[PDB]
Design an enzyme around this catalytic site. Structure first.
Site, PDB file in Angstrom:
ATOM      1  N   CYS A  72       0.955  -1.291   0.000  1.00  0.00           N
ATOM      2  CA  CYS A  72       0.000   0.000   0.000  1.00  0.00           C
ATOM      3  C   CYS A  72       0.887   1.200   0.000  1.00  0.00           C
ATOM      4  O   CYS A  72       1.955   1.243   0.587  1.00  0.00           O
ATOM      5  CB  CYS A  72      -0.689  -0.037   1.496  1.00  0.00           C
ATOM      6  SG  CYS A  72      -1.574   1.385   2.004  1.00  0.00           S
ATOM      7  N   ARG A  82       8.512   8.412   7.386  1.00  0.00           N
ATOM      8  CA  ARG A  82       8.323   9.095   8.546  1.00  0.00           C
ATOM      9  C   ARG A  82       8.788   8.302   9.733  1.00  0.00           C
ATOM     10  O   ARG A  82       8.963   8.816  10.842  1.00  0.00           O
ATOM     11  CB  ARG A  82       6.911   9.579   8.815  1.00  0.00           C
ATOM     12  CG  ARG A  82       6.393  10.671   7.747  1.00  0.00           C
ATOM     13  CD  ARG A  82       5.080  11.009   7.924  1.00  0.00           C
ATOM     14  NE  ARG A  82       4.600  12.099   6.951  1.00  0.00           N
ATOM     15  CZ  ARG A  82       3.418  12.808   6.980  1.00  0.00           C
ATOM     16  NH1 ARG A  82       2.442  12.606   7.934  1.00  0.00           N
ATOM     17  NH2 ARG A  82       3.076  13.564   5.918  1.00  0.00           N
TER      18      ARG A  82
HETATM   19 BR   LIG Z   1       2.664   7.760   9.601  1.00  0.00          BR
HETATM   20 BR   LIG Z   2      11.216   6.250  13.541  1.00  0.00          BR
END
Ligand SMILES: [Br-]
Ligand SMILES: [Br-]
Ligand SMILES: [Br-]
Ligand SMILES: [Br-]
Ligand SMILES: [Br-]
Ligand SMILES: [Br-]
Ligand SMILES: [Br-]
Ligand SMILES: [Br-]
Ligand SMILES: [Br-]
Ligand SMILES: [Br-]
Ligand SMILES: [Br-]
Length: 95
Positions: A72, A82
């Site tokens: 995905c 992130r």
């Molecule tokens: Br995230």
């Molecule tokens: Br991290």
């Protein structure tokens, strides 16, 4: 963090109301958990659920020695960049 349940009958992790989930598929004799779709309806956005669902799934694979494929798009383009510390759980041939 919201409770995320494991719903095997469906291969997804999901909030307890069933309404947000990430779906997967197990490849290579159980050893690879492929993440195919993370789904959070618009009325549940802003609660961080996609990332909470990806943590559930990554923790589950780390705990069980699974390698993840980040199929995905939410995962590979938002979650992993992130949260790099989870990159080593990615199967080594993806990237
Ligand atoms: Br995230
Ligand atoms: Br991290
Ligand atoms: Br929830
Ligand atoms: Br819920
Ligand atoms: Br499966
Ligand atoms: Br399998
Ligand atoms: Br193998
Ligand atoms: Br399995
Ligand atoms: Br959010
Ligand atoms: Br979200
Ligand atoms: Br990085």
């Amino acid at each position: 963090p919201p409770k995320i349940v494991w719903n095997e009958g469906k291969r997804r992790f999901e909030t307890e109301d069933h309404e947000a989930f990430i779906e997967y598929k197990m490849r290579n004799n159980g050893k690879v958990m492929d993440l195919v779709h993370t789904y959070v309806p618009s009325f549940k956005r802003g609660l961080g659920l996609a990332s909470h669902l990806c943590v559930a799934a990554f923790e589950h694979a780390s705990s069980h020695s699974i390698s993840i494929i980040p199929s995905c798009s939410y995962v590979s383009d938002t979650f992993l960049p992130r949260n790099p510390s989870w990159k080593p759980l990615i199967h080594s041939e993806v990237f």
